[PDB]
RNA sequence: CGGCCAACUACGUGCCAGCAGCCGCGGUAAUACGUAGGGUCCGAGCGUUGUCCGGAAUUACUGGGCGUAAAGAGCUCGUA
RNA sequence: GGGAGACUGGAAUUCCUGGUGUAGCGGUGGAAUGCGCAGAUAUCAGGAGGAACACCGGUGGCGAAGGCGGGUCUCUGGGCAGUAACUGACGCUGAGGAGCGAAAGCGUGGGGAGCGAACAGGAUUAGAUACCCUGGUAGUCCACGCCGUAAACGGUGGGUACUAGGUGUGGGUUUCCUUGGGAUCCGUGCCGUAGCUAACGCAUUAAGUACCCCGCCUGGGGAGUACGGCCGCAAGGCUAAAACUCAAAGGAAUUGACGGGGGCCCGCACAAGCGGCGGAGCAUGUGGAUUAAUUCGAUGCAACGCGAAGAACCUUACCUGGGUUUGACAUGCACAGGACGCCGGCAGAGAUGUCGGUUCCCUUGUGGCCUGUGUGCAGGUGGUGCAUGGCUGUCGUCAGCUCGUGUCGUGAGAUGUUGGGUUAAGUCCCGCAACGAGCGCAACCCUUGUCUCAUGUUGCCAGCACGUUAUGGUGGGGACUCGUGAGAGACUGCCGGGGUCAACUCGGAGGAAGGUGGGGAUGACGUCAAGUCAUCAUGCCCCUUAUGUCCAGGGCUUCACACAUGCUACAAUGGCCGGUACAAAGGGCUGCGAUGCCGUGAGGUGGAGCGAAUCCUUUCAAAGCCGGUCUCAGUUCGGAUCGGGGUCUGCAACUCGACCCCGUGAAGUCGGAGUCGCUAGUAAUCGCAGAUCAGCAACGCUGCGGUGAAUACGUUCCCG
């Protein structure tokens, strides 16, 4: 990924809507032996997302690096994924496993900061979280820890969803501090939203 | 390795015309010598200008030197000042008198020689080589009416020690078909690390037009 | 043209003077290269010398010598497992005529008469009686075939 | 002032002299050796060596494993 | 076929005695040691003795695991189902511990047929202390004990509860049809969801979901080793470290390459032929050694009649010597100029120096022109093809190589492109989680094969006329060629059969030609750090008083050798003399050069005529045919070598040219191991022209035509 700063007198750079947040996690040239030598190709693990908390995971195969990055962008574009939150935190401590990828995603009080390793830091920095506390146990990789983090975010659910599963009136599903954090986060949603209307 | 014959020399009987045209018995070696020194004399300032083709028709010892380029305005500066200087030096180096016709190509980016010009002159200018090619194309892919393209670049690419050849294309470029109308142009970039020889194949169409 | 199957062969015209397939085929196997006309002069002159020493039709003498040198079995050289086996095989008609004419010409060429005409005359005559070295090569080829009869089973 | 790991160019030696925490750099065009400019990080300090905890879920109570990766006693009966 | 003890059965192998009976048997990839000829192997009868149990018998039964199959009898262990009669949690696991525990091995005593470590001989091999062969002791067997190990493996500790199924088979109970089906409890296999796993896989017989107890692991070596202890008759087992060292050692799967793996295919790959090379002489090229110098490159296939399509001087890069400095060649600066430069004379090997004649063209400031003196600088066939570009070879004219988008997979990746058939071919059809594309293959192009239309000189000459000497030679003619333009024509198009009624294949017709008619040109993605800084261009490094440059002479041609490609041969299908018939293509200006004359002949003198369908290369050939002679021989074969005598080219044929004449007259009697080319106008043989070139090392290279074969049964074997 070099020589991107450019000014063209051509038709268009085609800049348009959906200015999302896009992170390229790792690139390892992938070789293939054929008759008389090696054929080098490229893999780019592409994370895309918006600051609401919708995450994509794309996996680009091409024999050029920006081609593989662009194919990962289109593949994560094809496949988004909804993550439920509280304010800008996570709901409750989970462990995700993608066959060797263990990631523990635990919430924290706000202000602490996204503390995670670089793959999980990528998937969570694209997402709508600002203050959680994760760790990547096992598998020491990028692909399995990204995919394990997304499986970990599939083990998430709303407080309300849990209440619904059990047919119980909330209050009765959460404890009270987390309901107060719901009041804080929806209150600042009201303040920034009504400042957004004017 | 790739033992690929120059396709403008592989279809020079069938589709592509000769560049130089006369008849000569016992005057032929002299006409060859004048043809060579004329093309060396039209190498430098016209390769600044954007030269593509240098045809020399030759009637009863006058001469007619015709050049196809991409900017009438650098070849013809002030009228007669830039034209009649190289014209007059062609009149003095040859022992003859020169009728220099200068003409523009309707699209520079679909001449394979001019594509090789712009690509190699970008590649001497420290740009990214995969970006250059890839932009060598996109443009030409187009634009007129141009059914192939194939760009190869060997040499010290990016200043590296290994001489890596690259091979990008789009569409149909059949070399073994003789009704191909393929334009071919190889021009050689001059970096400080060395020379990056650029080959460009451009397949315009199936049309024989016999 | 092997490994694709049998290949079609050229049809062979008969002799002008004698009128036989076998005379012309003897000419084309007499042909030390270049001079087919001189091969015709050798074969024709040798068969009129056979006409002198027989007083009969020369092609009957030729076909009787050709019959008396013609083999029925030929030995091969097929090798099953670390031992070379002389394998006897039935000989086709064209293969047998080829071995008859080729042995006739070559062992006429070894014989010590002055010209080639007297060599080929004396070899067609001695092969007609049965006294040439070529008949001894037929008996040595059947000696190798009958001596090696057991290996012939492979059905090969 | 290769990579991790903020920070790059020329000159000089070209498997030498040397470097290095690991991966590894030196075979006359080294951003990895030595000198220079320049940059970065610290600052009355800044590097090295040693010793310990950490990262190490790498002795796993919290928090690991045992078909083939290290790992199921050859198989039973039975005392605590 | 759970175990132990006891008794017994037959087939087979070996030996033994006795018949019958003869020279081989045995053994192997092929053989030989070996047993025989004293009576073997073979066959028949009888006898001994030992061990193992054909068939039933297998993905089957039983046992805790080892393990267990001839039969019968005796003693004994466990399992399963059914009823629920009894006891009433008595269950589970189990550190240490005791017991059982294949084979090999160990002790004492028996037994010893077959097999058989060790051990011989034989063979194979470079060598076998090996496989293969012949013999052969401990052992294998039984009694009584030791030992305690195995890939003792389901590589899966024991118990328990639950979690879709489908189909086999083993043991037993019952409801229904009335053996069939169902349901059930216990067992053992194959396939399969969910779930699990790193992946392969597992999957109600879990590697799934959970609980209980035990064993065990903590990077690879060092090492299951030392030290110590315990057990053991011993071999050894058990328990079990550290220094030190490495930056890994591993698991599963992927793409390739590879295989003395499998299948299916092809190619002068072998076979069938024909002709060669390797031995002789020479011609060329290379190695090596020489040398003042033997310039430089190219060393498996794919270097070695290759860069060279022309080394006396030149070329030329090398050597001894003589010169030389802005240089042999450019261009930008300064600075003077006025001619530069020329045509000579002289001295010199020549470069060069010194004398003699000519002295500029515009303008008024210079330019065209050079020399100086400097200045940048030119110049390098100096180095690096492991810094490159360009051009090229090769795998191979082999059939392949990829991509886009979809799906499959955590991923590398796969799929497509695999399957069925077909093809010269990833050619093409039919299927199939793929659907399409692209570069290749084919086609487009040239040449060759037939005809139609056009077509008339320099080309043809039939029908006409005229020639006479010499012929289309000449008036003439478009008829035949032929020359070069346009066009038709081969498409499985037409008929028969196989084809899945698809592709395609076997035959037939028409046709000049039949199935890509023949041959070209055409080299995919890449490989090999292949070739080339000496064609050229070029990055960097080096020389700049020489590694530049000018000349004479020398060398690149040396030669005790070794290789490699060619040519002439070794004779009678031949040699030599005489007569005679048929080509194709080409070449030509300070070139090709005729008749005539002089030579023996290279050639000399001369110039007809042609920038050439015209003239010249003679109307063109040679091998061919007719005739004569030679008589199998170191020759009337063979021409190397050497002597004399010439001609031509060039300033110059000494080192180093070709050709002719006279003489001279060697090796060589078809060529060891090995090896090469070729499938039809091919091989073989016969001349002809061309490029390079003043001349030629041309027997080379590129082409042209003449005469013209044999064989291919077929994929076992070698090669790709």
From Swiss-Prot, chain A:
Record keywords: Ribonucleoprotein, Ribosomal protein, RNA-binding, rRNA-binding
SUPFAM superfamilies: dsRNA-binding domain-like, Ribosomal protein S5 domain 2-like
One BP annotation, GO: translation
Alphabetical list of Pfam families matching this protein: Ribosomal_S5, Ribosomal_S5_C
Transmembrane spans: none
GO-annotated molecular function: rRNA binding; structural constituent of ribosome
InterPro entries reported in the protein's UniProt record: Ribosomal_Su5_D2-typ_SF (IPR020568), Ribosomal_uS5 (IPR000851), Ribosomal_uS5_bac-type (IPR005712), Ribosomal_uS5_C (IPR005324), Ribosomal_uS5_N (IPR013810), Ribosomal_uS5_N_CS (IPR018192), Ribsml_uS5_D2-typ_fold_subgr (IPR014721)
Source taxon at top rank: Bacteria
Residues annotated as domain S5 DRBM: 20-83
Compositional bias segments (type: Basic and acidic residues): 1-18
GO CC terms: small ribosomal subunit
Domain notes: The N-terminal domain interacts with the head of the 30S subunit; the C-terminal domain interacts with the body and contacts protein S4. The interaction surface between S4 and S5 is involved in control of translational fidelity.
Subunit structure: Part of the 30S ribosomal subunit. Contacts proteins S4 and S8.
Biological role: With S4 and S12 plays an important role in translational accuracy. Located at the back of the 30S subunit body where it stabilizes the conformation of the head with respect to the body.
Family (UniProt): Belongs to the universal ribosomal protein uS5 family.
Protein name from the UniProt record: Small ribosomal subunit protein uS5
Recorded name of the encoding gene: rpsE
From Swiss-Prot, chain B:
Keyword rRNA processing listed: no
Keywords, in A-Z order: Ribonucleoprotein, Ribosomal protein, RNA-binding, rRNA-binding
Listed GO CC annotations: cytosolic small ribosomal subunit
Signal peptide: none
GO MF, any single term: structural constituent of ribosome
Residue span(s) of domain KH type-2: 38-106
Annotated GO biological process: translation
Domain of life: Bacteria
Role, per record: Binds the lower part of the 30S subunit head. Binds mRNA in the 70S ribosome, positioning it for translation.
Family membership: Belongs to the universal ribosomal protein uS3 family.
Miscellaneous comment as given in the Swiss-Prot or TrEMBL entry: Binds 2-aminothiazole antibiotics, which are antitubercular agents.
Quaternary structure and partners: Part of the 30S ribosomal subunit. Forms a tight complex with proteins S10 and S14.
Name by which UniProt lists this protein: Small ribosomal subunit protein uS3
Organism of this sequence: Mycolicibacterium smegmatis (strain ATCC 700084 / mc(2)155)
Gene: rpsC
Full protein stretch here: 1 to 210 of 275
Curated annotation (Swiss-Prot), chain C:
Organism name: Mycolicibacterium smegmatis (strain ATCC 700084 / mc(2)155)
Name of the protein this chain belongs to: Small ribosomal subunit protein uS7
Gene Ontology cellular component annotations, sorted alphabetically: small ribosomal subunit
Stated family: Belongs to the universal ribosomal protein uS7 family.
Pfam families listed in its UniProt record: Ribosomal_S7
Highest taxon of the lineage: Bacteria
GO BP: any one term: translation
Function: One of the primary rRNA binding proteins, it binds directly to 16S rRNA where it nucleates assembly of the head domain of the 30S subunit. Is located at the subunit interface close to the decoding center, probably blocks exit of the E-site tRNA.
The protein's assembly and partners: Part of the 30S ribosomal subunit. Contacts proteins S9 and S11.
CDD domains assigned to the protein according to its UniProt record, in alphabetical order: uS7_Bacteria
InterPro entries: Ribosomal_uS7, Ribosomal_uS7_bac/org-type, Ribosomal_uS7_CS, Ribosomal_uS7_dom, Ribosomal_uS7_dom_sf
